[PDB]
Structure 1
Amino acid sequence: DDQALSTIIQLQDCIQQAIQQLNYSTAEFLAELLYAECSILDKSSVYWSDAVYLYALSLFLNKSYHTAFQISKEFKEYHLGIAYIFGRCALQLSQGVNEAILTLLSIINVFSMVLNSNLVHIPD
């Protein structure tokens, strides 16, 4: 448990580093591994939501829109970036747009769960 948190933080730093450069397959593998590792952690933990968002973002970047859309749809309410990825996937595919409106309207109206984070590509 003492080193368990350190590994997750190191994976997060590595995934942001990989996404910063135009290296996407490595980002894919790191996001898959982190998402698999965070499975034991409870859903209430911020780490699970962060890993799910990172995995969904990596899936979106690698043109595999269907998998990203499904992954974001599983936990669209938990995080803001997951809602962003779900909305972008809906725009790219025109599937399930109504869920995107009912989620995005609530998230924007409340702003003006987890809403703010330091990760990459967090929407404003």
Structure 2
Amino acid sequence: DDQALSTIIQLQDCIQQAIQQLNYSTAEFLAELLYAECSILDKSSVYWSDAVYLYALSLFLNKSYHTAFQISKEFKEYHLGIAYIFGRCALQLSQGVNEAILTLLSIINVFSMVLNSNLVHIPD
């Protein structure tokens, strides 16, 4: 447990570093590894939400829009970035746009769960 948190943090920094450069397959594998590792931890902890958002972002970036759309649809309410990925996938495929609307309207109205984060591509 002492080193368990360190591995997750280091992995998160690795995915951010990989996404910062135009290196996407490595980001794909690293996000996949973090998403698989975070399975044991409970849904209430933030780390699961951040890992799911990173995995969805990596899937969206790699043109595999369907998998990113499904993954984000699973946990769309938990994080704002997951909702962003859901909206991007909905615009790209024109599938399930209504659910995207019912999520984004609530997230925008409430602002003006997890809402803010330090991760990359966190929307404003």
> Aligning the two structures, in what range does the TM-score lie when normalised by the shorter sequence?
over 0.9
Per-residue displacement from partner, 1:22-51 (whole Å, max 9, x unpaired)?
000000000000000000000000000000
Q: Distance in 2 between matches of 1:35 and 1:44?
A: 15
Q: Distance in 2 between matches of 1:88 and 1:22?
A: 20
| Alignment match, 1:65 | 65
Structure 1 residues not aligned, in runs of 5+:
none
1:12 Cα deviation from its structure 2 partner = 0.1
1:118 Cα deviation from its structure 2 partner = 0.1
Per-residue displacement from partner, 1:24-80 (whole Å, max 9, x unpaired)?
000000000000000000000000000000000000000000000000000000000
Matched residue SS, 2:122: coil
Percent of aligned positions that are identical: 100
Matched residue SS, 1:81: helix
Q: Which runs of 4+ in 1 moved over 6 A?
A: none
Residues matched between the structures, number: 124
| Alignment match, 1:93 | 93
1:10 Cα deviation from its structure 2 partner = 0.2
Structure 2 residues not aligned, in runs of 5+:
none
Q: Distance in 2 between matches of 1:106 and 1:49?
A: 18
| Alignment match, 1:108 | 108
TM-score calculated relative to the size of structure 2:
1.00
1:21 Cα deviation from its structure 2 partner = 0.1
1:114 Cα deviation from its structure 2 partner = 0.0
Q: Distance in 2 between matches of 1:24 and 1:121?
A: 14
Superposition CA RMSD, Å = 0.1
